[PDB]
Design a protein around this ligand. Structure first.
Ligand SMILES: Nc1ncnc2c1ncn2[C@@H]1O[C@H](COP(=O)(O)OP(=O)(O)OP(=O)(O)O)[C@@H](O)[C@H]1O
Ligand SMILES: [Mg+2]
Lengths: 1554, 396
């Protein structure tokens, strides 16, 4: 409609219709006028068709009228140009003559008709050879004409060549036939183009024969389309299409994508002078449009192809499939008019419907049922390649095209069977088309001979092969064809490559020369290059070396852009569009192209541009560039444009693996597989040394430098180290990295350690000097190979170093050190000297407190040494091994470096890293580096990335945050995400801590990042250092109880014993959360201090019980069940008896030691009777003041109230409660929070809650806690965590005490402003931006308190809570999982406190409660399956039913007893013959007592039915009833033996109503 | 499967514990679970001793049907089921190889007549269909709804409501509606399915019988072609009935289940009329007759190269043949006589069918595939029944 209206509107103009023709014709693009007259039309291809009669126009003429004449004349004009031409060739005219004057469509048909005529007669005579050469000459003649031809006619020749090759091929095949029958068989399969020399209606004069069936050429213009090479397979497809059409059926071919099924239908059309309309189905395509197009195709009598019909949506598919049946059923019958889209429309019988069927994941697709008897399905298969190969060789300049095509294919086929099955290996035809494509420039160098083919095989196939397969290629290449001895471009490139590497530092090894050669030759042909290899293969070295060698050899400069592909988003990189304002901003990949394309203001013409992608490559990113990888060489925008890429501009891809990428992506690009590292261990060192020396030249005199480089060369020889590196493998390595990549770690350290002692090398003894060198080198070599080792292994390796190094040379000790004087230059070798620490009570727990060990100093020294090298450090080790503190304390001490702490979580972004840096860093725009990012203060900065192996990876599996650090470590500069520019970071260091990746939660790291790190595995200490370390901890806190100063050691020994035992008794094999570390010890020691610092002056009996309380809360609250819980009771007893031998202790069980500050002003042990009463008076108040819910306060609950109380008191208070359900965990939390004076926030989530909602809930609670000083308690239930992210938000709120995301950018500035206001209001101004944020975070850490209530920890979503490291470490795990039999009885009793009852046999109340417990115990034991997920609930509601039911029944028993007593007084008044029987009615009066006996036990059954039975089976109910009845049988309660639940609780009036 | 299962469901409770492991160690041999010889006692069990004789004789189909005979039940013929059945609706599904449409014709003819076949094709057929449905129930005539699955979108809207609403169909004259499904195919609404009675047409015709059934209609077409052609139409009759026979036997036989239609015969015969119409009556046109039948007409749906060779090798034998063809071992087809009577030749070629009787070993003798392959197949369908029964017993 809209387009059509424009045509009716644009009538005045006429010329404006040409736009819309492209649509309604398909072949033509724009129409040609002389204004009054239409001279012709031009096709979308560029070909100009002129009409016979130029159609006259007047102003008041309709479009419909004039255009209709054009469609007719356009077809006639094609017949004219056909007959004119056909007649010419018949009159012996060379085809080169004709091409220049006739449109392709015409000349093609003329050739076909004459060819067919000439071969038809040639089958009779058998004069094939005479015609063959004749044809072959026309082919050669056309070929040479093409080379010298205008681009437009260049299309026409090529298109014709496809056909002439077909001609000669068929003739040659026909020459070869054994007999004439053989020739008549072959000829029948072919598409034979006949003309009727008989007849009128010329448009109907040309017809086509195939397999016996005929098909009239309709005369439609086709223009000059890209013509498919003729294959046997193609003819067979043509043959099936003709066989379906002949019987008025629809053509349909199913098969795998890339088999050209629609292209076939396009071509089959063309061959018959038809422009096929192709519907790309389900490219978000409307049904309304298709329904229109279907009417048009049935009227105009066109061919429609459904391109990938399978991909439609079921509603559409039904509707469309039914319509199509109308058409095909209309044709088969031949109905003149058929009804579709509920209107009577006429049907041309020239109409046809074609369906291509791509396969699904499930299988090769099918047609809908109705279409099955309307269509004819066929199986498209990839072409046997030989036939394609021969033609392609023919076109280039054949030599012997037949032999090459057979030989190339055999070889490729042979490689496939003979090489290893390797993933990226493709020996499919795609590959041979590529060999052939690469061949054309090669032919220019050598010949249209096999030799040029041979070279192209090894130019493409060989760079992607790996060593085993590399010979198979060479063996079978010579086995199939041998070409030549010597290669061109052999000397010249090579000296330009050697000269570039000598300059770069590199060694030209077998392999480095090879992979440099492979690369050089590929850039020539390929514009997209891929380099695949292990981390540290030599890629960056290969391309950086080759590219450098080309500026020497060509004289062309290069402009390299190295981009980390996966650090940036598709939007940051290609171009990101905003959904509503549609505002288009550049990106990164597109913006650097606009320098070359849009404005080549400087010199780009003579330059070579290379855009490198260093990061892992994935479908999503390459798909957004696939057009540049295509033969197109243009970039397609998401919205707005296509930008063309010049021949200078090459895209490289260096990566470690391919697994994700598609075989289609590989075969567009040139692939360079690095089977092994380019370079020798030694050669690496050599380069590494010199690279290190160059750094020193900028900060060290030449005299110093010359002497120190001499030292290094003579101290360490390769022969010794070779065994050392070999022995490195025979060793267990945490956070594994290969030997070769560990090398940079040695040399960088070694050279720094020697440049350290440079001054003392001036005057020291030459024999003694060597000993200082050898020791340092033996040291630096150790941490670089065995630093990530057990250290049990280190010690072992130390001897291995000593072994292989010279025997006389200074041997390595575990703690071996070199020492020089405080006040005078000196030299001696002494090890392990320690400053001694005394700290006060208050100092005991502090985020920055180190009690230095022989090993703390050992690690802190090496850790500091590596930073002097400026190599990145990964401290890998168990939780609480001190990896964070060693890093922190070595640097919190020195003036040089300043630390910046980032915690990583499962989903942390690269912006969080930047935002954390922006706080401590200042960009300067110096013309020296353009933008730079040094630290905001003059001296060096250290990023500490904690939990570096925590952030998760793309579904492909690639963690961008790690690659970003890798960018900073290797590149030393990064690209700006929004502004799009390179900023080079100055003087910034990357250090990380991580856990062993054998631990749960942990993600495996890319070798490409860990290669730039020194890895130090630090473990747990001693069990004898732990004992010693906490002695000093107790020493400090016993400053407050000086009367027991002698008790610090046995307390420290006991604490460590308790730890060692808990770790041993309760392992992750029983429960996942059973995970102990010295952090527990630290928890206990501090937990002890806080009790002392705020308690009564202490007896020895106090302190051990004080200690015991903390011991319980730290080690045993997390314990599930009772067997393990009792095990700890015995352990605690066993420990005191072994270290603190007293008879003054009491019951050490948690139930008996209750410590509180609710009753006393000082934290003291309180009386059980005193506490219970205190809770009782406060719960009523909390019940009155807050939400009204009554409960029974019981033994468990008092113990738990104190547990939550301690948690909510500590600075950071995080307790997660594990309580089944209805235990009351949520209510107690609300209570204790109210006692502590905390605002209880409970996230208001629901099914239709977004993350943004929860974000808001969180943000407010955070802003109130710091900027309003609120003191909120956040209760999060398992139900509240709706997604992964929700739980991630909760993690960020515990690992750090802020959520970074909530306050970023402008909302960071508004927070920052408000922060300054409140800080000053309180009375403190803070010098720096960092001083401010740390107040904010610290405020949150002390005012916000999170309690988690998880019910079934067995649930996979609730398992993720406990799993989460952040939550696990900073929460106090507490277990309430089941109600015990005692606590059940306590609760039952208070609920049946109301006493309707009367005396029974045997206590009466005591019996009832014991039954219900024994029923609940039997219910879960028989019915429920699975291990202890569920607990007391029905029990509470079962008791509540009984109370409601006894009251209802006893008041109705007494009501009927009152109804017979009132009738007793009325009959006695009267007393006659019958009435004395009525008086007798004591049978009923006697009956009542027996009826009342059973009503208590009858209510038991009725309540159990209502509560426990609702969801049980017919048989499941009956069977439990028996167990209940026999329980009622054991206990002296009476029940009705003939009892029926229905009759007992249903009334006949209600039973009827239902 | 339900036979073997229900047999063990009865006899495990009823007979001895020694019975239980004996029959189960046998069902284990039929399956690939285990191989053993059951515990043997003189006269102790005789029916069970008779069964193992079937399993040890490598005879699989016999041992599977053993459990059916042991029920001592009359296995009800669709007629008997329909007669007993007390509803006006039925859905009979079947494999695409066959259609019980023609069984229903003889079912209606033998009792109560009133046969009305209704194809659900286009708007017209569904539209005519809904008219013939409402009128036939008042009339009381039988009705058939051919291949509903294809027209299904309509079912959920018109038939699903229509059949649900028609509780007055019980009130209406004796009338019965039948629907044909395909088991491999679009899933019918469960609610409509449960309401309506269900049958599976499992009746597979022999090679010779299908040849006779193909050739049978061929006289209705009239006469438009040569006498010679009727010989080629006879050739195709045998050919089509030979590939269809091979279709079921898989994997041994064809690689996958392929479905061949009366459309495949039609497209083949059309090509045959065309080759005889465009060539002389000389026999030698035969070369490209095979190629076009074996690669476009029938080889079209075939995608696997393995199977494409089988269709070709069938054409090798069925089409090229001078003087004597010998389609099957017993039957020879000679080429048309000089007399050139077209009426005689129909009758001659019909007579050649009436002379022959299909042997015991047909699937191996007639379809030129080996006997050992047929046994391999018999073994596997045994294994499938035996497996699924063991699985069922342990599940309960
Ligand atoms: N010829 C050589 N002589 C000495 N050392 C070399 C030589 N070639 C490569 N190297 C060493 O190997 C390193 C090569 O860097 P490169 O980036 O190529 O490895 P990579 O395999 O690309 O790692 P990644 O896959 O992570 O990018 C250099 O730092 C250098 O020390
Ligand atoms: Mg690299």
């Amino acid at each position: 409609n809209d387009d059509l209206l424009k045509i009716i509107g644009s009538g005045k103009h006429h010329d404006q219709v040409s736009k819309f023709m492209k649509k309604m014709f398909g072949s033509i693009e724009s129409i040609i006028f002389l204004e009054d007259f239409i001279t012709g039309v031009r096709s979308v291809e560029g070909e100009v068709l002129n009409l016979n009669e130029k159609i006259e126009l007047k102003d008041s003429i309709q479009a419909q009228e004039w255009l209709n004449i054009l469609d007719t004349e356009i077809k006639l004009s094609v017949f004219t140009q056909f007959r004119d031409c056909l007649g010419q060739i018949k009159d012996g005219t060379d085809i080169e003559v004709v091409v220049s004057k006739y449109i392709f469509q015409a000349i093609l048909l003329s050739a076909q008709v004459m060819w067919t005529e000439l071969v038809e007669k040639c089958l009779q005579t058998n004069q094939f050879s005479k015609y063959w050469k004749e044809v072959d000459m026309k082919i050669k003649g056309l070929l040479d004409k093409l080379n010298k031809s205008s681009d437009n006619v260049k299309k026409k020749i090529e298109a014709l060549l496809v056909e002439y090759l077909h001609f000669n091929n068929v003739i040659g095949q026909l020459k070869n036939c054994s007999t004439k029958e053989e020739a008549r068989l072959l000829w029948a399969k072919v598409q034979k183009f006949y003309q009727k020399n008989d007849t009128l209606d010329d448009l109907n004069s040309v017809f086509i024969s195939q397999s016996g069936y005929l098909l009239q050429y309709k005369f439609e213009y086709i223009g000059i389309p890209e013509r498919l090479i003729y294959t046997p397979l193609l003819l067979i497809g043509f043959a099936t299409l003709t066989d379906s059409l002949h019987q008025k059926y629809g053509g349909c071919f199913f098969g795998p994508a890339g088999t050209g099924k629609t292209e076939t239908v396009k071509a089959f059309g063309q061959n018959l002078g038809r422009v096929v309309v192709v519907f790309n189905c389900d490219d978000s395509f409307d049904y309304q449009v298709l329904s229109r197009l279907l009417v048009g195709i049935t009227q105009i009598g066109a061919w429609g192809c459904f391109d990938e019909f399978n991909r439609l949506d079921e509603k559409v598919l039904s509707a469309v499939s039914a319509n199509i049946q109308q058409i095909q059923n209309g044709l088969q019958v031949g109905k003149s008019h058929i009804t579709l889209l509920e209107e009577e429309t006429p049907l041309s019988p020239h109409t046809a419907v074609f369906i291509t069927l791509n396969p699904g994941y499930n299988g090769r697709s099918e047609l809908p049922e109705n279409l099955k008897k309307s269509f004819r399905e066929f199986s498209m298969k990839s072409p046997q390649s030989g036939t394609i190969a021969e033609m392609i060789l023919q076109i280039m300049g054949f030599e012997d095209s037949k032999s090459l095509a057979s030989k190339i294919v055999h070889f490729l086929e042979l490689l496939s069977s003979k090489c290893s099955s390797m993933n990226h290996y493709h020996f499919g035809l795609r590959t041979l088309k590529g060999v052939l494509r690469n061949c054309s420039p090669l032919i220019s160098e050598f010949g249209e001979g096999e030799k040029t083919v041979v070279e192209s095989l090894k130019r493409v196939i060989l760079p992607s092969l790996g060593d085993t397969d590399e010979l198979v290629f060479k063996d079978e290449l010579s086995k199939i064809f041998d070409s030549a001895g010597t290669p061109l471009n052999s000397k010249a490139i090579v000296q330009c490559l050697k000269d570039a590497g000598q300059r770069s530092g590199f060694s030209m090894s077998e392999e480095f020369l090879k992979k440099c050669m492979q690369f050089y030759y590929m850039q020539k042909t390929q514009q997209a290059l891929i380099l695949v290899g292990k981390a540290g293969c030599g890629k960056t070295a290969t391309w950086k070396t080759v590219i450098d060698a080309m500026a020497i050899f060509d004289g062309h400069a290069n402009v390299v852009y190295v981009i980390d592909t996966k650090v940036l988003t598709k939007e940051s990189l290609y171009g990101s569009m905003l959904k509503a304002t549609l505002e288009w901003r550049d990106g990164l990949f597109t913006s650097i192209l606009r320098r070359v394309n849009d404005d080549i203001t400087g010199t780009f013409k003579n330059s070579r541009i290379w855009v490198v992608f260093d990061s892992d490559l994935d479908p999503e990113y390459v798909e957004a560039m696939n057009s540049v990888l295509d033969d197109n060489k243009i970039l397609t925008l998401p919205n707005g444009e296509r930008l063309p890429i010049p021949p200078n501009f090459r895209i490289l891809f260096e990566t470690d693996n391919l697994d994700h990428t598609t075989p289609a992506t590989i075969t567009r690009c040139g692939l360079l597989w690095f089977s092994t590292d380019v370079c020798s261990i030694s050669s690496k060192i050599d380069h590494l040394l010199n690279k290190s020396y160059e750094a020193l030249d900028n900060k060290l005199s030449m005299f110093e430098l010359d002497k120190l480089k001499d030292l290094i060369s003579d101290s360490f020889d390769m022969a010794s180290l070779t065994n050392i590196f070999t022995c490195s493998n025979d060793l267990v390595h945490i956070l594994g990295v290969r030997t070769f990549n560990k090398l940079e770690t040695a040399v960088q350290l070694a050279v720094h350690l020697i440049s350290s002692y440079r001054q003392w090398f001036q005057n020291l003894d030459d024999k003694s000097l060597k000993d200082v060198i050898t020791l340092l080198i033996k040291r630096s070599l150790l941490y670089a190979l065995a630093g990530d080792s057990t250290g049990e292994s280190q010690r072992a390796f130390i001897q291995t170093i000593n072994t292989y190094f010279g025997h006389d040379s200074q041997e390595l000790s575990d703690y071996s050190t070199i020492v020089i004087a405080n006040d005078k230059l000196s030299f001696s070798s002494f090890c392990s000297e320690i400053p001694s620490v005394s700290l006060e009570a208050h100092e005991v727990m502090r985020p920055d407190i180190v009690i230095p060990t022989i090993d703390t100093i050992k690690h802190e020294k090496i850790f500091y040494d590596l930073l002097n090298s400026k190599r990145g450090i990964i401290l890998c080790g168990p939780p609480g091994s001190g990896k964070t503190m060693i890093m922190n304390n070595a640097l919190r001490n020195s003036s040089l470096y300043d630390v910046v702490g980032i915690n990583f979580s499962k989903d942390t972004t690269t912006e969080h890293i930047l935002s954390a840096l922006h706080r401590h860093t200042n960009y300067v725009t110096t013309s020296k580096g353009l933008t730079l990012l040094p630290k905001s203060d003059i001296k060096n900065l250290v990023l500490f990335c904690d939990e570096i192996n925590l952030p998760k990876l793309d579904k492909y599996g690639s963690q961008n945050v790690v690659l970003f650090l890798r960018q900073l470590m290797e590149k030393q500069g990064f690209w700006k995400t929004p502004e799009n520019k390179w900023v080079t970071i100055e003087r910034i260091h990357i250090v990380g801590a991580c856990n062993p990746p054998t631990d749960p939660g942990r993600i495996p790291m890319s070798e490409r990042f860990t290669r730039h790190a020194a890895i130090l595995y630090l473990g747990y200490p001693s069990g004898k250092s732990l004992s010693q370390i906490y002695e000093i901890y107790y020493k400090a806190i016993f400053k407050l109880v000086p009367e027991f100063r002698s008790y610090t050691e046995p307390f420290a020994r006991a604490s460590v014993h308790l730890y060692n035992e808990c770790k041993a008794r309760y392992s992750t094999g029983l429960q996942s959360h059973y995970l102990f570390s010295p952090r527990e010890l630290t928890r206990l020691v501090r937990g002890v201090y806080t009790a002392i610092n705020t308690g009564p002056r202490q007896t020895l009996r106090s302190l051990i019980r004080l200690w015991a309380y903390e011991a319980w809360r730290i080690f045993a609250d997390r314990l599930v069940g009772v067997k393990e819980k009792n095990s700890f009771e015995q352990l605690l007893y066993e420990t005191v008896d072994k270290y603190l031998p007293n008879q003054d202790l009491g019951n050490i069980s948690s139930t008996s030691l209750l410590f509180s500050g609710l009753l006393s002003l000082d934290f003291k042990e309180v009386n059980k009777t005193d506490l219970v009463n205190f809770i009782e008076e406060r719960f009523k108040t909390f019940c009155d003041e807050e939400l009204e819910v009554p409960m029974v306060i019981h033994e468990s609950m008092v113990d738990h109230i104190l547990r939550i109380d301690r948690a909510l008191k500590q600075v950071q208070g995080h307790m997660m409660l594990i309580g089944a359900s209805r235990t009351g965990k949520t209510i107690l939390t609300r209570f204790v929070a109210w006692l502590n004076g905390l605002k209880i926030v409970q996230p208001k989530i629901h099914r239709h809650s977004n993350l943004s909602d929860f974000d808001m809930i969180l943000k407010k609670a955070i802003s109130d806690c710091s900027l309003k000083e609120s003191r909120t308690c956040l209760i999060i239930d398992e139900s509240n965590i709706l997604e992964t992210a929700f739980l991630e938000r909760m993690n960020t709120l515990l690992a750090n005490a802020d959520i970074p995301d909530l306050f970023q950018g402008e909302e960071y500035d508004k927070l920052l402003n408000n922060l300054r206001n409140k800080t000053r209001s309180l009375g403190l101004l803070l010098d720096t931006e960092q001083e401010l944020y740390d107040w904010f975070v610290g405020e949150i850490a002390k005012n916000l308190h999170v309690v988690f209530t998880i019910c079934d920890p067995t649930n996979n979503k609730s398992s993720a809570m406990i799993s989460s490291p952040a939550l696990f470490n900073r929460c106090i795990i507490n277990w309430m999982g089941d109600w015990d039999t005692k606590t059940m009885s306590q609760v039952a009793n208070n609920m049946v406190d109301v006493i309707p009852m009367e005396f029974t046999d045997f206590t009466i109340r005591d019996a009832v409660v014991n039954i219900l417990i024994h029923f609940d115990r039997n219910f879960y034991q028989k019915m429920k399956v699975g291990v202890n997920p569920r607990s007391p609930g029905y029990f509470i509601d079962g008791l509540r039913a009984l109370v409601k039911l006894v009251t209802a029944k006893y008041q109705d028993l007494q009501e009927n007893q009152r109804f017979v007593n009132v009738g007793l007084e009325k009959l006695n008044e009267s007393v006659k013959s019958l009435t004395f029987e009525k008086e007798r009615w004591l049978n009923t009066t006697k009956q009542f007592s027996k009826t009342s006996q059973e009503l208590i036990g009858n209510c038991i059954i009725s309540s159990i039915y209502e509560t426990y039975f609702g969801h049980l089976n017919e048989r499941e109910r009956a069977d439990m009833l028996v167990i209940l009845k026999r329980l009622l049988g054991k206990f002296a309660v009476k029940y009705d033996v003939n009892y029926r639940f229905i009759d007992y609780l249903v009334t006949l009036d209600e039973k009827m109503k239902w | 499967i339900m036979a073997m299962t229900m047999f063990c469901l009865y006899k495990f409770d009823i007979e001895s514990e020694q019975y239980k492991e004996a029959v189960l160690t046998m069902i284990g041999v039929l399956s690939e679970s285990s191989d053993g010889v059951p515990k043997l006692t003189v006269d102790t069990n005789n029916d069970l001793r008779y069964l193992w004789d079937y399993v040890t004789t490598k005879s699989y189909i016999s041992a599977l049907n053993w459990f059916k005979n042991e029920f001592f039940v009359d296995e009800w013929n669709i007629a008997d089921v329909v007669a007993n059945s007390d509803n006006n609706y039925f859905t009979m599904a079947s494999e695409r190889d066959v259609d019980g449409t023609f069984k229903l014709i003889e079912l209606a003819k033998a009792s109560k007549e009133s046969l009305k076949i209704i194809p659900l094709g286009s708007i017209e057929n569904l539209n005519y269909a809904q008219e013939e449905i409402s009128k036939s129930k008042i009339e009381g005539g039988w009705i058939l709804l051919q291949n509903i699955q294809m027209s299904l979108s309509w079912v959920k809207t018109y038939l699903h409501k229509h059949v649900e609403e028609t509780k007055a169909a019980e009130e209406h004259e004796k009338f019965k509606m039948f629907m044909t499904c395909h088991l491999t195919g679009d899933k019918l609404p469960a609610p409509l399915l449960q309401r309506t009675d269900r049958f599976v047409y499992e009746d597979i015709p022999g090679i010779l019988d299908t040849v006779k059934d193909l050739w049978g209609s061929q006289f209705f077409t009239g006469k438009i072609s040569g006498v010679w052609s009727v010989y080629c139409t006879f050739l195709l009759s045998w050919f089509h009935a030979l590939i269809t026979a091979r279709t079921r036997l898989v994997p041994h036989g064809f690689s996958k289940k392929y479905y061949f239609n009366d459309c495949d015969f039609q497209f083949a015969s059309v090509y045959l009329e065309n080759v005889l119409a465009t060539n002389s009556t000389n026999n030698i046109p035969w070369a490209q007759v095979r190629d076009h039948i074996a690669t476009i007409v029938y080889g079209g749906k075939i995608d696997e190269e393995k199977d494409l060779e089988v269709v070709a090798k069938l054409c090798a034998h069925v089409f090229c043949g001078s003087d004597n063809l010998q389609i099957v071992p017993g039957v020879r087809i000679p080429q048309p006589l000089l007399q050139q009577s077209e009426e005689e030749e129909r009758a001659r070629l019909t007579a050649i069918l009436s002379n022959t009787i299909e042997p015991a070993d047909s699937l191996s003798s007639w379809l030129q595939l080996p006997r050992e392959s047929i046994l391999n197949y018999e073994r596997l369908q045994a294994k499938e029944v035996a497996s699924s029964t063991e699985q069922l017993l342990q599940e309960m």
